[PDB]
Each structure stands twice: as C-alpha cells, then as structure tokens.
Amino acid sequence: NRKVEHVEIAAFENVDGLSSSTFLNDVILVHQGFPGISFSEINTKTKFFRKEISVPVMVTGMTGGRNELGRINKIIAEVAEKFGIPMGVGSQRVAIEKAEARESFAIVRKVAPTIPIIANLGMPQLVKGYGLKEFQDAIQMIEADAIAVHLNPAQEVFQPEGEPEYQIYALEKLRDISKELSVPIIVKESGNGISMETAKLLYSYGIKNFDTSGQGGTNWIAIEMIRDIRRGNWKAESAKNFLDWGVPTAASIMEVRYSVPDSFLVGSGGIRSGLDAAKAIALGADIAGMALPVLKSAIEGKESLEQFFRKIIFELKAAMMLTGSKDVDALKKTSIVILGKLKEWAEYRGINLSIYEKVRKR
Amino acid sequence: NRKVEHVEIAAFENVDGLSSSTFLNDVILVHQGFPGISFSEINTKTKFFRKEISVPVMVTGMTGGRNELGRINKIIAEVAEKFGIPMGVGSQRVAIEKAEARESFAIVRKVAPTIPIIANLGMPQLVKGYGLKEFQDAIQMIEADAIAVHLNPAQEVFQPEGEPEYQIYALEKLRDISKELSVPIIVKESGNGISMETAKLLYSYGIKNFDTSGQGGTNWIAIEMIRDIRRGNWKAESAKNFLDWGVPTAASIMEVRYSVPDSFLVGSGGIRSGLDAAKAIALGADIAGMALPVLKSAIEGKESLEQFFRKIIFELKAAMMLTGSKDVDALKKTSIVILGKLKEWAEYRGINLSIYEKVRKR
Amino acid sequence: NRKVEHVEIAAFENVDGLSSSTFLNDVILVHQGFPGISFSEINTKTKFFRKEISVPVMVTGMTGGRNELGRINKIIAEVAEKFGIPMGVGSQRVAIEKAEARESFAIVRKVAPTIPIIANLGMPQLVKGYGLKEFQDAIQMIEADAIAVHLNPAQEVFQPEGEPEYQIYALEKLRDISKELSVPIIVKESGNGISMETAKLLYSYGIKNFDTSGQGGTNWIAIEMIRDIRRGNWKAESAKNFLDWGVPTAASIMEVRYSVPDSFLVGSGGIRSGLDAAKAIALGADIAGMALPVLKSAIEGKESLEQFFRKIIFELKAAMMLTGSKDVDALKKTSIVILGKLKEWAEYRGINLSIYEKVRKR
Amino acid sequence: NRKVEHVEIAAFENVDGLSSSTFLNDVILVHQGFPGISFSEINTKTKFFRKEISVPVMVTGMTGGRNELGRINKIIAEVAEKFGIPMGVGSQRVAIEKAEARESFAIVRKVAPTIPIIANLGMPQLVKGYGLKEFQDAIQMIEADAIAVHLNPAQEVFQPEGEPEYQIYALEKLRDISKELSVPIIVKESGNGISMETAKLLYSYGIKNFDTSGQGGTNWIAIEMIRDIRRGNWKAESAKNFLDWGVPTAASIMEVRYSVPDSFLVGSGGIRSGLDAAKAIALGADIAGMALPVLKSAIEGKESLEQFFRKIIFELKAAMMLTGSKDVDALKKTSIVILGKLKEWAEYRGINLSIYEKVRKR
Ligand SMILES: C=C(CCOP(=O)(O)OP(=O)(O)O)[C@@H](CO)[C@@]12Nc3cc(C)c(C)cc3N(C[C@H](O)[C@H](O)[C@H](O)COP(=O)(O)O)C1=NC(=O)NC2=O
Ligand SMILES: C=C(CCOP(=O)(O)OP(=O)(O)O)[C@@H](CO)[C@@]12Nc3cc(C)c(C)cc3N(C[C@H](O)[C@H](O)[C@H](O)COP(=O)(O)O)C1=NC(=O)NC2=O
Ligand SMILES: C=C(CCOP(=O)(O)OP(=O)(O)O)[C@@H](CO)[C@@]12Nc3cc(C)c(C)cc3N(C[C@H](O)[C@H](O)[C@H](O)COP(=O)(O)O)C1=NC(=O)NC2=O
Ligand SMILES: C=C(CCOP(=O)(O)OP(=O)(O)O)[C@@H](CO)[C@@]12Nc3cc(C)c(C)cc3N(C[C@H](O)[C@H](O)[C@H](O)COP(=O)(O)O)C1=NC(=O)NC2=O
Ligand SMILES: [Mg+2]
Ligand SMILES: [Mg+2]
Ligand SMILES: [Mg+2]
Ligand SMILES: [Mg+2]
C-alpha cells in the first residue's frame, strides 16, 4: 500500500533535503543588540482565517486511510490542539472511495475540537471527475475549516504507476466549487514549489491562499526514485537526474508574495527549526508550514512531539527576541539581508528588491 | 589507426567532462506546479530542414572508415531510424581517399532510409584542396540531407601529427561550394565551442546552421593528451594546461543565438540526459546534439542504445511536463533562471539579458 | 560559579569563531610597493577620550569578581600599562552587590595608574533598578575613564538561567545618567554585533561611542550551548541552530560608521592579529578591540602576554608600512577592496559604497 | 649567505603560490573555432626598447654574487641568447661592494652578446647613498640595455635582519638619475604587486616602464617566514598571517595598464605556462616575465631549460592559434572574459570595464 510505503520512506530513508536546497541559508535576519522589548512580552498569536492560533506555524497534510495511519494522525492532532497549532490531514481520496478509511481522518476532529483543521484533495482529482460533493464530503468528515488542494506533478511523473494530468478544465471546476463551498481553498505544492506563473494563473481563477512547499525539504522525486529502485523500475535513473528540480522554498516565498501581494501565504518545504520558520515569515510568508519532522517525532510518540514543538516555539521566539520583534506582525517587517543564489534568482526573475522590501512589509 | 584509437580513448578512458564544464548547472528551468497540460498530449516533433523528426535531438558525427567502425554506424543508424532521430556520420575524408572505406558509411543509409543523415568533412580539407566534387561525393555516398563541416583546431594543435590551418580562403571556398550544393551546410565545433566572433564571421560567408559542440562534454584536448602520453610525446604536459580551454556549451548556445538570431542551432557538447537537452533548447538551441553517450551505448549493443534513447526521451518529456511545455516551441519560450558563472560570462560579453530573453523566444 | 565557568569555557573549549565569521576575509588592504615612508617613522599613537594611547588597540572587558579572576585582571592590567593600551574590566554587577568582590577590579588601577580603564555594567541592570549611583560606584571603584554598557541578549536567550529584558525605559535612564556622569559612556555588544538600527536608536538617546563586538570571534551562543549540554538542558539544540546568528564584525564596523559618521568606534569581535586590527581601522573603526586571545595569553603568564602584544603591534605596523600609512590617521584613509559576502551585505543594506568611502576617510 | 639561502628556499621548499593567488583563473581567453590563420604563420616577435626579441617573454632578475650563483646565471643567459629572450640579473649591490662578485654577473654578457640584458639595484639603496655612479657601474658591468630598480618592502618587513626604508627622497634621486643614464629604468615589485597608487606616484617621477611582479607566484613573505622558522625568530608567526598579502598579478596588470595607459608593462608573478603568458598579455601586459620556474630548470641543466622554453613557446603559440592571433599585437587585442574575484576587485577599485577594454586594446 502506497500510503504506508510513502510514510515509511519519508520517515526512515534519506530523502530530507536530498540534493536540494531551500535557499534559506541565503536569508539573514539582522541581529538587534538592543531589542527594545523583553522576552516575556513576545506575542506569537496570529489569525488563521476565522480562528486565532497560538503560533504562526501549521502542520501540513501527510497521512490517513488506515488504522496505523490514523493513530499517527491522532498523536499529531492531540498535540497540535494542546499547542494551538492548525493541522492539515493528508489526501482524503481513499476515504471518498472507501468508508472504512474515514475514521483514520475523523479522529483528528474528535481529539482536536478547536484548532483549524484543513482537508485535502489532489488537483488531479478535479480532472478525473471530482466536484462539489467530494469536496463537501472531505470537509464534513473532519469539520474542516479549509480545504487544501495539492499540486504534485513531479511526484506523478516519476512514480511507477500512471501519468500526471493538469488540464485547465480543473481550474474552471475549482473556481466553480469555491463559490459553493462554505470554507476557503488553499492550493499547495508538495516539494517542488510555486512559481510566479503558477501563482498568477491560480489567482486569475480566484485562488488567494497559497502554501509554497518548495524544494529543500522532503524530496518527493527522491521518494519515487526509491520506490522505482525497489521495484527495479527503469525510471529510477531519470528520477535521479531531477533530484534538484523545483523552486527553492525561499525563492517560492518571494515569488508568491511578489506576484500576488495580498495572498495569504504558508511558507513550507524544509522548515526544520523555529529559525527557519522566522526566516520564512520575515521573507513574506504569513505562517510557516512543516510536515516531515512532525511525522518523525509523532512516530516516536506523544511526548517526543510535545518536545519538538516546545523547541520550534523557543527558536522562533529567540529569533523574534533577537530582532526586536514583539509580535508576528513586527517579524514580517524586520530587517533582513538576501545574498548568494537567492539574490541572483530574484534579479533574473525581475524581482526588484526595493519593491520587494515594500510588498513584504505591508 | 587514429579512428580506432579515437573511439577507444573516448569510449574507455576518462575524457568526458575532464576538467571542463558545460555551464548547464547555471541554467534552471522554472518548475510549474500547475502545468496546464497532461503528459500524453506532450508533442516532441520538430523540423529538421525539409524533414520532420520525432524528438528534437540528433546524434552528431563520430566514426566510419573500416568494418568494425561501420558496424557501430549500423547499430546507431538502425536505432536512430526506429526513433525518428537524425544522425551525422564521422569524417568521410578516409572514404574520399580509399574506396574500401565507403561501405562503413553507406550502411547508415541502407538501414536508415528515412531519417535525416548528415555527411561530414573537416574545414582543413578546404585549404588542402577539397572542393565541390569531394563535397558531392560525401553527400551522395549516404544520400545525405545535409553536410557538417567541422572545426577542430584545438584537437589539431595538441595531436602528435601535424599543424592546424584555418586561412580565410577556406571560407571563400565554402561559400562557393554552398551555392552549388543541393543540401544545407552545418558548421560544427568538436569540443571547444563556438563564439560570437566565429559565428558572425561564418554568417558573413553565408553559413546559417551551427552546432555549438561546447566544452564540458567529450574533451578532445584530453583525448590528444592521452595519445601524447602513450607515445611519450613532449606536448602531453602542454595539453594538460589547456584542459579547460573553450567556450562552455551553455555560453556557446547563448553566444550563437544572440549574435545570429535567425540561425538554426544544435546545442551540443556534454548533453547527457533529456534534462540537459531540455536546458539546451530553452536556452536558445533548436535541437540538442549528442555523441559520446550514444557511442558507449552502441558499443554495448542495439538494445542498450534503444534503452538509452527511451531514457533521454522520457527525461525530455518530464522537463516539458514540469514546465507546462506542450511542444518544442513552448519549451523554447519557457521560463528559466541563469546564475553564477554563465551569468558573469554573458555580462562581460555584452549579452544584455533582456534582449536575450526576447531573442531566445522567437 | 558562572564567572569562573565562562572563563574556563572561553579559554579551554572550542568557541572562537565556532561556525561564524567576521567577514574580514572579504576586506583587502591594497599593497603599496613604494610605501613613501620608512619603518621607524611609523607612529601608532592615537586619542582615547582625554588620554593619548600608544597603539590604537584596546582590551575589552572580561572578568573580575573573585581572587583568581582578580589575578587575571592584574596580569592584563600591568601589561596594558607597560604598552600604553586601554583596558575595560568585565561586568561589575557582582562588586556592586558584594564588597569582597571589589578588590578583584580595583587591583587594575593599582597596577595601571595611567592608561584609560573602562568600567562595565550590563544594559539589563538599568531595567532592574540600577541607576546613577551604581554607575558612579562602578566608575569610582577603578577611577574609570569611561564606562561600557553591554548588550548581550543572545547570550541571555540561550543561557539556562533567566530571560532577556531590553525595554526602551533602559535607554531613557541611560540618557538621564549620561548627563550627570563625569566620564563618557560606550555601548558595546558581546559577540553578535551592532546594526544600523541599533546604532541609530542608541544615537537618538545621546550615545556616540560604540564597540561593535561582531560575530566571528568569541561565540557566546556556543558558550551557553556548552553550559546547556553540560547540565543536560533542553536549550542546547536550539543554541546550536543559532551558532551563526549576528552581524559579522566587518559588516558591523561598516554599519556603525555609515549610520553614525561621527561616532567614536571600537571594532572588535574576532580581532586575532595586527592585520585584523589594521583591517578594522581601515574599514572605519577608530580602534580595534580584543578580548579572548588576551585572556588565553594572560592565563599563560605575564611574559606570554607581553610577547602577544609585541606580535600584534608588529603585525599592525607591518600593515601600516605595506600600505604607506605613516600614522593611524593615514591608515583610516588607506585604499582597500571589499569583495564577496561583505560586499553583498552592504549592497542589500543600502550602504552605497561611494558614500561609504567618503565617510570612512573623514 | 643570504643569496645562497634564498635560491635554495625558492628552488627546494614549498613557496610557489603558497596561500596566494594570481587571479589568472579569473581570466578566460575566448576560443575561436575558426582561427583565420595557420599555425606556421604565427609571429611571436616584439620590441624590447631598442632591440627586437623573438618571443614576448623575459627572465626577470634573480641571482649573482658568487661563483655557484654565476654558473646558474651562465646557463640561463646562454639559453636565453639561443631563444632570443631578454634576461634581468639579480641584485648587483654585492658586486658594487666587492670586486670578486662581479664575474658572476659579467658572465651573462660574455655568453649572451645580443639579447637585452637588464641590470638590477634595489630602491632602498637610493636612500642609503647609491646614486648615478653605482647605477652606471651596475649597467656597465654587463653592458645592460636597461636597469630594473626593485621594490621589496614586504620581504624586508619580515626578514630577520633590518627594516624597510622607502622615503620619497628615493624617487627624487631616481628621477635625477634617469636624466643622466643612457638606458631606460624599469621599476619592478618582487612578489607583492603594483597598485594604481604606486604606479601613478612612480609615473609622476618620470617612470614609464613597470614589472608587476604580483602575488600568486614566488612568495617572498613565505621565504622569509621559512628563514625566520629556521632561526627560531619571533616574526615567523607574523609572516604566516601575511602569506596572502599583495596585489594578485592579474589585478596588478589591470591596475598598471588602466592607471598608466601608455606604460610599457611586464606582467609577472606566478607565470608558469605559455597560457599564463598569453593571459598576461591579453590582459594588458606587453610582455610576460618569469623567474622561479627558469631557476628550477636551470638548476637541472642547460637541456632541461631549453626544453622548458620550448614548452612555454609552444603553449603561447597554441593560445595565439586558438584565439586567431597572428602576432603579439593581435593577442593584446583578442577577446577575453573576466569573472569572479578579479571582476569584483576591478569594480571596487573603480576600473570601469568598458574603458578598460578600450585601453588594453591600444
Ligand atoms: C502522498 C501524498 C498524497 C498525494 O499522493 P497520492 O498517493 O497521489 O495521493 P492520492 O492518490 O491519495 O490523492 C502527499 C502528496 O505528496 C501528501 N502526503 C505526505 C506524505 C508524507 C509522508 C509527507 C512527508 C509529506 C506529504 N505531503 C506533502 C507535505 O504536506 C509537505 O508540503 C512537503 O513534505 C514539504 O514539507 P516538509 O519539507 O516535509 O516540511 C502531502 N501533501 C499533500 O497535500 N497531501 C498528502 O497527502
Ligand atoms: C575525428 C574527428 C574529426 C576529425 O579528426 P581527424 O582524425 O583529424 O579526422 P580527419 O578529418 O583527418 O579524417 C571527430 C571530432 O574531432 C569526430 N569524431 C568523433 C569521434 C568520437 C569517438 C567522438 C566521441 C566524437 C567525435 N566528434 C565530435 C562530436 O561530433 C561532438 O561534437 C563532440 O564529441 C561533443 O559532443 P559530446 O560531448 O560527445 O556529446 C566528431 N566530430 C565530427 O565532426 N567529425 C568526427 O569525425
Ligand atoms: C560574558 C560576559 C558576562 C555577561 O554578563 P553576565 O554573565 O550576565 O554577568 P552579570 O552582567 O550578571 O555580571 C560578558 C558580557 O557579555 C563580558 N565578559 C566576558 C568574559 C569572557 C571570558 C570573554 C571572552 C568575553 C566577555 N565579554 C565580551 C568581550 O568583551 C568581547 O566583546 C567579545 O568577547 C568579542 O571579542 P573577542 O572575539 O573575544 O576578542 C564581556 N563583555 C562585557 O561587556 N562584559 C563582560 O563581563
Ligand atoms: C633577493 C632579491 C633581491 C633583494 O633582496 P636583498 O637581499 O634585499 O638584495 P640586496 O640587499 O643584496 O639588494 C630578490 C627580490 O626578492 C631578487 N632575487 C630573487 C631570487 C630568486 C631566487 C627568485 C625566485 C626571485 C628573485 N627576485 C624576484 C623575481 O624577479 C620575480 O619578480 C618574482 O620571483 C616573481 O616571479 P615568479 O613567480 O618567480 O615567476 C628578485 N627580484 C629583483 O628585482 N632582484 C633580485 O635580486
Ligand atoms: Mg498521485
Ligand atoms: Mg583533422
Ligand atoms: Mg545575565
Ligand atoms: Mg633590497
């Protein structure tokens, strides 16, 4: 089973940042030796649609569809609830198809009654016949506060089974569906990043909420490579040539914030510390997303995951403290330096740095 | 025999990218998380002079002149025919001189009756007396659809036997010949690349078709170095100092497309994957060329070469799919980023990046 | 005891430049093959407030607070006096609180009657009740010629005990204090550097004297990381994520000189040779500071520390000789080159290099 | 004896390029696949003051002063005469002071009656009482066609014995002397390079002929470091800190040619192949100088040195052939690329690349 195999390869093989980069090493937060605040007044609260959350971080969707997967969703959800952190579940297709797969998603809401919970379906489902009703069912199954629709064409190109399909018709349908839905749609990538062209196209169809999921964290091309190697599939060697395919997370954050200045933006793909999260937010994200390190702690257990979030939160407040940022808003506006390849990326892409400074700050 | 030794050194020694670079690591194709197409509608067909080809890739000229060499030409040709891929043969000098060497070229047309076949003579033959008749004989011997005239002065400088000769008279003669020939001439390098000054000089004599053959692939200075080492020739240590001599393929593509915007352009030299080929094309080439990796697979056998092309084609379509490029024309216009040394090369050479963008996409 | 532990970790663990950089490798002094002077006329004297000092180098504050610490202060003070070099003592808070800790500071003046001596208290003390009287007591204890107020929020974030406090009220108080004090105030960092924003805020409260204490020297985040590891404190792994936090010394010198052109500036944090000292001054510092390498020599003994200063002074004169700088003033105006990351830092931070050149030369 | 030790350290210890760089890796000669010439027509002749020389390369001054040194001067001189190559002798101070040292210089003219021979005294001699008469004696001793006056302040700073003296009076005297001398003066560095400031100051005193001697070849600071280590002298560690002190040869060539456009320029310091020599000349030098590798071959024997010059000349013609440069003039004008640190050096130093292109081409 593909869902089990995915979790096992992500958690126990070497695919985190494999031959790829976030370009976050190119972003420096300027240290403020006179912060102007004290540690105890640092306020980490922010908005997440109609709800308030305790920390500008979310867990992005990963799993569900059978009981061992549901027990990972349970650990993640009950810890996220405790910490006031939003949580996306993984793809719900399996539970649209099979009633026994429902509980492994529903459990999330039982144990996390108050945080934002975000449903999940894949864009390809929209050209294979999914419509309003499947979306409402994904949403109602966990009383979702939003639904994420994922883009994973890279993964689909290199996986043994099948071929990606991304006709514009899917966007027409998406646009129709968003007018009848009572919760917002977020469009997220899954390891390879969102460019300006893709963010503007999505915007022209009514999409305002993005999750970057850039290269440099979980490498889904590497994951499929490993599944190909395991079955002696021919594609393995081709996947290896594409290991560094994608938009780096930090470049993707800049590209979505610049091309759609009023977007609500999750910066994710390789966020591994509260310092990475602070960088993502100062660059222009509204919140930082994480998947893989949450998975690996959850598999270790509830208390491991509690420790993990304590660490992320401390690191984030440390960066806020050391930049003079009393709250999330001030963090979005703090002083940064951009160097090296990220800077060359932006310049070639016509990202005028002065208008960038202005846009990331309002 | 030099032809045999050449093939043996290229195939079995360490001379592929030896101390050299294509600069293709400096070209990035911008990933499109919503491609807007489906994998099965990707069309790879393109024009090659008066014929249509199935994939925008060619095999560039390598060998011929005796029976063991002819059997390599046979394998390559019958596989290229099967895949709808054009094929250049190696230098036909030896078959102009000796009737017995003819069959080792002619076999290409016997087993490949439909694809473009490209004949081959060296530029120095033009100052050693070759004229119209030798060109017509090269062409007729394989019913060629075109003839390539090669520039290899770097190789000639370091080889033990003789000295390069490139007087302008050769171009006058080339110019005369091209008005009496019923097929087009392509001018190609052989490892060291074509600059703007050389492309403009060639153009001023009526040459419109170029094949970059840049540094970063097969290193012909290294091949000669090794021939020198083998014979204890003094020049070996001098060849070693020139290992990184030449214009990197990526820079050569930019230089030719910029200095001659209506050229028909083969991007070649170090093309090892369908992703290299995609980059070569997006940069400004009309098609990608390959020699060495085709040689090494052909030596292994028919089925090894068939598998090799399946892999190149898949990698190419993967890059087209992940950039939203439904056909070769879309690929020539797709978004890219250029960074690092390639970017510094272009700036010092006066290649205004904005006018470059415009020129590479019409 | 924290003071003892600090000295032992700084002196005997690996924390000097740990994962951090001064960016001084990006500063090059232009060699002058015809210096225009002779070695023996080189004059290293310069002003330090109302006194004249023999060398434009100071020892910045480190220790004090018990007898073994006082014996280190004594060695450093008596050598500094012999060389005509100013000396800052470490934080005097402990001697405000406990009369027995006083002698370990006062010994500095007994043994060094003429050189400038610089008192020390931490900025957080100002929001914890310290004011005029404690400042006058720190000064009188050693008949100080100045008092340094230190910023160490990074160190405080990562240390096991407590939390940093840097409300603006501290600056209000500092500003009132400075009007009743009879010696100047210097504000220094302690390993993480001073930015333009912090220098400007400090300036707007009447502070004119700065000591950069940039990253790339003693890494106080690493020191607290090590104290955390030793106690099995959870923060250790978070400290490790921040090892390269802060403004590099060279960038901090540029930022302070640019944002406050008339400041009196100590360039410190990783000054390890007379060449680093020459670099700091040519970049815009008025004098170079050192802490750690003086400590390590002092622990070895009086004669070890004498040899250390002889080496620093020789290296500084060598750099003056090789740039044609007859005095400290000529050195501040000598030709330099700025390359690589320091150059990209300055550009992103809006430090126009031409106005920089003008400002650092006046 | 210092002369013997210097030769032994340079020839047999690791001091060539030690921790230093020429920046010539940053200069690329553009390859021309159609050279437009043939190898046998390449002409390497050029002027050297009033004489003609066969190759635009010289041996810069090294040794003399006793019989074993004289025998090295004899091998180098007789080979240079055979090849049509100018030769500078090392410092003649010892032969001004002691009549027995004379023959070890004079032998150069006996064995090389036609090529330019360049006499040698140090700049500090001019403030130590040398004047016209000592200059005429240096010149007459070998019937010199020119005299080189060397700048070696870096070497003097770090050597155990003494101190450097470069008062302006030396230039006043030099300026007087050049008006009574019947041959030209060349001012050369010796490992640390010539800047714009130094070139302009020299020029204002009537100096028109320069030899860059930049960092990246023989490292005179390292040589003195090694002499210090051997005697347990304290300066050793200080010398180690200055190993990368100086203007890289490539940068010095650009600085002298830009700041003094009509100068006659020897580009030297780390020239190790005829490709380095071609780079030096294309950058703006009129000729390339070499010292160290000539010494090492001469110590091996007459036939070793003859083979060395054959290698250098072949490499130089190869680079001329591969750039379409039929003569030394065309080479000075051929297409280049400048990248990386050399490019950043030039930009910070105000060397406008477009006016540079113009100036190096006349
Ligand atoms: C398996 C998935 C469903 C689609 O595949 P399919 O089998 O076709 O599905 P159907 O047929 O059932 O429709 C993935 C999609 O890649 C997915 N599951 C899932 C598994 C694991 C185990 C980890 C680790 C990450 C994902 N991520 C990306 C994750 O949310 C992050 O954006 C990236 O990992 C980057 O963040 P870091 O670097 O890790 O911090 C998921 N993203 C999705 O939106 N939905 C998911 O379910
Ligand atoms: C022998 C040749 C020319 C004549 O030499 P000579 O003995 O004086 O001949 P005469 O005229 O005197 O009879 C070579 C090129 O030197 C040549 N054969 C030849 C063999 C091998 C075995 C490989 C490997 C590649 C060449 N290539 C370059 C190839 O087409 C590609 O451009 C480059 O290899 C770059 O692409 P990659 O990086 O590899 O993907 C050929 N190019 C040609 O134009 N002509 C040829 O016949
Ligand atoms: C560690 C300290 C104690 C802080 O106070 P606390 O523990 O809260 O105690 P209370 O306030 O409660 O009393 C610091 C204060 O930051 C400090 N002591 C002190 C000890 C050691 C042993 C070395 C090595 C460096 C400091 N430095 C930085 C030094 O002056 C240099 O700026 C930097 O080291 C950078 O320069 P290099 O790279 O090394 O050349 C000092 N700086 C201060 O201004 N005062 C000090 O006392
Ligand atoms: C010892 C010297 C004289 C001054 O010393 P001193 O004891 O004060 O003398 P007095 O007091 O008696 O006057 C040197 C100067 O370093 C010198 N001898 C000398 C020896 C050898 C053994 C090598 C190797 C190089 C020199 N070169 C540098 C050479 O010409 C090149 O510029 C550099 O080597 C750079 O080019 P590459 O990288 O090698 O290709 C010479 N330069 C001079 O102008 N004159 C010399 O005599
Ligand atoms: Mg799928
Ligand atoms: Mg040939
Ligand atoms: Mg404290
Ligand atoms: Mg001398």
DSSP string, B108-169: HHHH-SSS-EEEEEEHHHHHTT--HHHHHHHHHHTT-SEEEEE--HHHHHHSSS---B-BTH
Q: Which helix (H) or strand (E) holds C59?
A: strand C57-59
Who's near D270: CB < 8 A, 6+ residues apart?
Answer: D16, D17, D20, D22, D24, D214, D215, D216, D217, D218, D249, D276
Are C242 and A307 a contacting pair at CB < 8 A? no
- Rounded alpha-carbon distances, angstroms, from residue C15 to A322, C267, C289: 20, 20, 18
Q: Closest partner residue to A339 among C123, C238, C341, by Cβ? A: C341
Task: Please work out, in degrees rounded to the nearest 5, the angle formed at the alpha carbon of residue C82 by the alpha carbons of C76 and C88.
Answer: 40
Q: Which two tokens stand for residue D158?
A: 């770090």
Distance of alpha carbon C323 from alpha carbon D356, whole angstroms: 25
Closest CA–CA distance from residue A241 to any residue of chain C (Å): 31
D81 labelled binding-site residue:
no
**Nearest atom, ligand 4, residue D148 CA:** 44
Q: Which residues does chain D have within 8 Å of residue B238's beta carbon, measured at their own beta carbons?
A: 273-274, 311, 314-315, 318
**Nearest atom, ligand 2, residue B60 CA:** 30
Closest CA–CA distance from residue A194 to any residue of chain B (Å): 6
Distance of alpha carbon B251 from alpha carbon B214, whole angstroms: 8
Q: Closest partner residue to D322 among B163, B194, B245, by Cβ? A: B245
Method: X-ray
For chain A, the distance separating the N- and C-terminal CA atoms, rounded to the nearest angstrom, is 46
Helix axes B103-111, B67-83, angle to 10 degrees: 20
User: What is the maximum alpha-carbon separation in chain A?
Assistant: 60
Q: Which helix (H) or strand (E) holds B188?
A: strand B185-188
Instruction: Give the closest residue to A212 by CA, choosing from A191, A228, A234, A230.
Output: A191
Of the residues B87, B92, B128, B218, which should be mutated to test ligand 2's pocket, given the most ligand atoms within 8 Å of the CB? B218
Closest CA–CA distance from residue A312 to any residue of chain C (Å): 8
Q: Whose CA is nearest to atom 11 of ligand 4?
A: D93
Closest CA–CA distance from residue D82 to any residue of chain B (Å): 20
Query: DSSP assignment, residue C235?
Result: T
Q: Is the dihedral of CA A228, A229, A234, A236 positive or negative?
A: positive
Q: Which two tokens stand for residue D307?
A: 């083979």
Distance of alpha carbon B353 from alpha carbon A348, whole angstroms: 8
Size of interface B-D (CB pairs under 8 A): 97
> Which phi and psi (to 5°) does residue A155 adopt?
-60, -45
Q: Which residues does chain C have within 8 Å of residue D193's beta carbon, measured at their own beta carbons?
A: 31, 33
Question: 3-class DSSP state for residue A8?
Answer: helix
Are D33 and B197 a contacting pair at CB < 8 A? no
The amino acid at residue B220 is W
Neighbours of ion ligand 5 (CB under 5 A): A 156
User: What is the maximum alpha-carbon separation in chain C?
Assistant: 60
Give C59's strand partners. Answer: C87, C290
Q: How many CB atoms lie within 10 A of CB A296?
A: 16
Distance of alpha carbon B175 from alpha carbon D179, whole angstroms: 59
Give the CATH number of domain C1-362; options: 3.20.20.70, 3.40.50.920, 2.30.110.10, 3.40.190.10. 3.20.20.70
Residue-wise DSSP of C316-340: HHHHHHTTT--BHHHHHTS-EEE-H
Evaluate whether C29 touches C278 at the Cβ level (below 8 Å).
Answer: yes
Instruction: Give the closest residue to B289 by CA, choosing from B256, B322, B262.
Output: B256
Q: How far is the CA of C5 from the centre of ligand 3 (A)?
A: 12
Distance of alpha carbon D61 from alpha carbon D119, whole angstroms: 8
Q: Closest partner residue to A241 among B35, B275, B340, by Cβ? A: B275
D213 labelled binding-site residue:
yes
Q: Is the dihedral of CA B138, B144, B146, B151 positive or negative?
A: negative
Q: Which two tokens stand for residue B63?
A: 């060998």
Give A248's strand partners. Answer: A215
Q: Which residues does chain D have within 8 Å of residue B192's beta carbon, measured at their own beta carbons?
A: 31, 33, 322
Of the residues C59, C62, C137, C149, which should be mutated to test ligand 3's pocket, given the most ligand atoms within 8 Å of the CB? C62
**Nearest atom, ligand 2, residue B152 CA:** 16
Evaluate whether B337 touches B28 at the Cβ level (below 8 Å).
Answer: yes
Are C167 and A339 a contacting pair at CB < 8 A? no
Evaluate whether D32 touches D324 at the Cβ level (below 8 Å).
Answer: yes
Of the residues D218, D295, D312, which should be mutated to test ligand 4's pocket, given the most ligand atoms within 8 Å of the CB? D218
Distance of alpha carbon D20 from alpha carbon D242, whole angstroms: 10
Distance of alpha carbon A309 from alpha carbon A324, whole angstroms: 22
- Rounded alpha-carbon distances, angstroms, from residue D341 to C317, D22, D26: 27, 11, 7
Cα Rg of chain A (Å, integer): 19
Q: Whose CA is nearest to atom 36 of ligand 3?
A: C269
Cα nearest neighbour of A349 on chain B: B337
Ligand in closest contact with the CA of C91:
3
Query: DSSP assignment, residue D208?
Result: -
Are C318 and D201 a contacting pair at CB < 8 A? no
Distance of alpha carbon A268 from alpha carbon C27, whole angstroms: 36
User: What is the maximum alpha-carbon separation in chain B?
Assistant: 60
Q: Which two tokens stand for residue C322?
A: 């090789």
Q: Which helix (H) or strand (E) holds B211?
A: strand B209-211
Q: How many CB atoms lie within 10 A of CB D303?
A: 11
Distance of alpha carbon B61 from alpha carbon B54, whole angstroms: 19
Who's near A334: CB < 8 A, 6+ residues apart?
Answer: A29, A30, A282, A323, A324, A325
Instruction: Give the closest residue to B62 by CA, choosing from B243, B246, B268.
Output: B268
Q: How far is the CA of D347 from the centre of ligand 4 (A)?
A: 31
Name every residue in A having a CB less than 8 A away from some CB of B: 123, 127, 151, 153-154, 157-158, 163-168, 171, 187, 189, 192-195, 197-198, 201-202, 234-235, 237-238, 241-242, 245-247, 341, 344-345, 348-349
Evaluate whether D323 touches D335 at the Cβ level (below 8 Å).
Answer: yes
Who's near B300: CB < 8 A, 6+ residues apart?
Answer: none
Evaluate whether C118 touches C86 at the Cβ level (below 8 Å).
Answer: yes
Distance of alpha carbon C219 from alpha carbon B72, whole angstroms: 64
Q: How far is the CA of D153 from the centre of ligand 8 (A)?
A: 8
Q: If 0-12 CB within 10 Å is exposed, 13-18 middle and 19+ buried, where does residue A127 land?
A: middle
Distance of alpha carbon C290 from alpha carbon C5, whole angstroms: 20
State how beta strands D287-290 and D57-59 pair.
Answer: parallel
Instruction: Give the closest residue to A240 by CA, choosing from B273, C204, C250, C176.
Output: B273
Who's near C3: CB < 8 A, 6+ residues apart?
Answer: C63, C64, C65, C66, C69, C90, C94
Which ranges constitute the DSSP H helices of B231-334?
A: 236-241, 249-259, 274-283, 292-300, 302-323, 328-332
Q: Closest partner residue to B195 among D31, D37, D314, by Cβ? A: D31
Are D154 and C322 a contacting pair at CB < 8 A? yes
D3 labelled binding-site residue:
yes
Question: 3-class DSSP state for residue A165?
Answer: strand
Q: Closest partner residue to B35 among A166, A202, A246, by Cβ? A: A166
Of the residues A69, A76, A152, which should be mutated to test ligand 1's pocket, given the most ligand atoms within 8 Å of the CB? A152
Q: Which residues does chain B have within 8 Å of residue D321's beta carbon, measured at their own beta carbons?
A: 153, 157, 164
Q: Which chains touch B (3 or more CB pairs under 8 A)?
A: A, D
The amino acid at residue B323 is T
Distance of alpha carbon D275 from alpha carbon D282, whole angstroms: 10
D62 labelled binding-site residue:
yes
Who's near A257: CB < 8 A, 6+ residues apart?
Answer: A263, A265, A283, A284, A285, A356, A359, A360
**Nearest atom, ligand 4, residue D294 CA:** 40
Task: Determine the number of helices (DSSP H) and then strands (DSSP E) in chain D.
Answer: 17, 12
Are B242 and D37 a contacting pair at CB < 8 A? no
Q: Which chains touch A (3 or more CB pairs under 8 A)?
A: B, C
Are A335 and C193 a contacting pair at CB < 8 A? no
Evaluate whether A145 touches A116 at the Cβ level (below 8 Å).
Answer: yes
**Nearest atom, ligand 1, residue A65 CA:** 12
Distance of alpha carbon B2 from alpha carbon B159, whole angstroms: 10
Are B345 and D353 a contacting pair at CB < 8 A? no
Who's near B105: CB < 8 A, 6+ residues apart?
Answer: B64, B65, B70, B73, B89, B92, B95, B141, B142
Q: Closest partner residue to A348 among B37, B38, B338, by Cβ? A: B338
Are A39 and C344 a contacting pair at CB < 8 A? no
Question: 3-class DSSP state for residue D286?
Answer: coil
